[PDB]
Ligand binder design. Structure first.
Ligand SMILES: O=C(NO)c1cc(F)c(Cn2nnc(-c3ncccn3)n2)c(F)c1
Ligand SMILES: [K+]
Ligand SMILES: [K+]
Ligand SMILES: [Zn+2]
Length: 357
């Protein structure tokens, strides 16, 4: 009956030496932690220590080349760091980055171990830099290694290869890397809600559309929920959870739930354009607690409004600690285009999931 929490200030060391106001700020994690202390949620949690991932553990999802190129960034002078960052889509690198990326992955491993040993029921990980855009062979969108994908493999490596892991990615951006790593896999169901705008919204690829349902034995186990036609909030996320996420998760019956918890769909986020409220995030969290006998790990991805990500993640920890879900005052019907999105996903996944028929 215990919630784990991992936070280590050394993860603030990764910074953008060229643009000190880049939105992926060191103080993202320090501001979330401070807010957990102000709401007296910290002292109610079990503190799980951070550790570095090993290179063997990074090879769970990533190639030797990729691991080696990022490792090499530790010793690089700024000129070479700049040159390295520019070989990927929207990466900045510092001396401390590789170590911050290892610490974000090892923290989630220790969290996943605490859950699967029974030391805790569920856990939150306040880590940076984020992960879901990192693929097997490259870095992308502020992500070096895919934290959530590596945690899924780590779980299976201390239990059994077929341990059923559900990854729910409610970060506003599509987890291009998560999807690719597990696209052929029936043991790991990936479900992403994301702004799409027919490929105008980052990371700008048709891989994030609803018709990408997975390949081979993993056909059905890749569920994309792409939003089009501007602003979305609590009503559209509640609806997608009611008709898609929760019916598909129940018929999959995960033994562990991982949340790629970006808070960039928050009211206030300058990159997302959405209005998902802190209470919206609490409801999403509370529904997922109904799965896998409550074995949920919430992993920080994006979210760039310091007040919004502080309020929203603290609100998710409150649900994990077993607090009553807040009143939404849900009084809104769905945007026309969010209904069109949900029926598109229901038509494409009904061949695979009996509960959408
Ligand atoms: O992980 C992400 N969200 O959670 C994420 C990753 C991304 F690469 C992008 C795209 N982008 N590249 N550069 C920038 C940028 N740079 C400086 C000032 C403003 N904007 N935005 C994103 F919009 C979001
Ligand atoms: K997503
Ligand atoms: K999959
Ligand atoms: Zn994002």
């Amino acid at each position: 009956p215990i919630t784990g929490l991992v936070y280590d200030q050394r993860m603030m060391l990764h910074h953008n030496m060229w643009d000190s106001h880049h939105p992926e700020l060191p103080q993202r994690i320090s501001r979330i932690f401070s807010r957990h202390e102000e709401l007296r949620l910290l002292s109610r949690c079990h503190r799980i220590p951070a550790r570095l991932a090993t290179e063997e553990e990074l090879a769970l999802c990533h190639s030797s080349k990729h691991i080696s190129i990022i490792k090499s960034s530790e010793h690089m002078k700024p000129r070479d760091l700049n040159r390295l960052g520019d070989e990927y889509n929207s990466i900045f690198i510092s001396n401390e980055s590789y170590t911050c990326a290892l610490l974000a992955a090892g923290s989630c491993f220790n969290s996943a171990q605490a859950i699967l040993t029974g030391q805790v029921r569920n856990a939150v990980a306040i880590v940076r830099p984020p992960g879901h855009h990192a693929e097997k062979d490259t870095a992308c969108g502020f992500c070096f290694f895919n934290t959530a994908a590596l945690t899924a493999r780590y779980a299976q490596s201390i239990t059994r290869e077929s341990l059923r892991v559900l990854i729910v990615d409610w970060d506003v951006h599509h987890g291009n890397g998560t999807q690719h790593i597990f696209e052929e896999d029936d043991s790991v169901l990936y479900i992403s809600l994301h702004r799409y705008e027919d490929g105008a919204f980052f990371p700008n690829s048709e891989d994030a559309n609803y018709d990408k349902v997975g390949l081979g034995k993993g056909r059905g186990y890749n569920v994309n929920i792409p939003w089009n036609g501007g602003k979305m909030g609590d009503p559209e996320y509640m609806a997608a959870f009611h008709h898609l996420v929760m019916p598909i998760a129940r018929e999959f019956a995960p033994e562990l739930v991982l949340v790629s918890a970006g808070f960039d769909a928050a009211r206030g986020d300058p990159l997302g354009g959405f209005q998902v409220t802190p209470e919206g995030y609490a409801h999403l969290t509370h529904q997922l607690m109904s799965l896998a006998a409550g074995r949920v790990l919430i992993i920080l991805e994006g979210g760039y409004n310091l007040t919004s990500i502080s309020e929203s993640m603290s609100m998710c920890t409150s649900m994990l600690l077993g607090d009553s879900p807040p009143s939404l005052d849900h009084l809104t019907p769905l945007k026309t285009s969010a209904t069109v999105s949900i029926n598109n996903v229901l038509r494409a996944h009904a061949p695979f999931w009996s509960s959408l028929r």
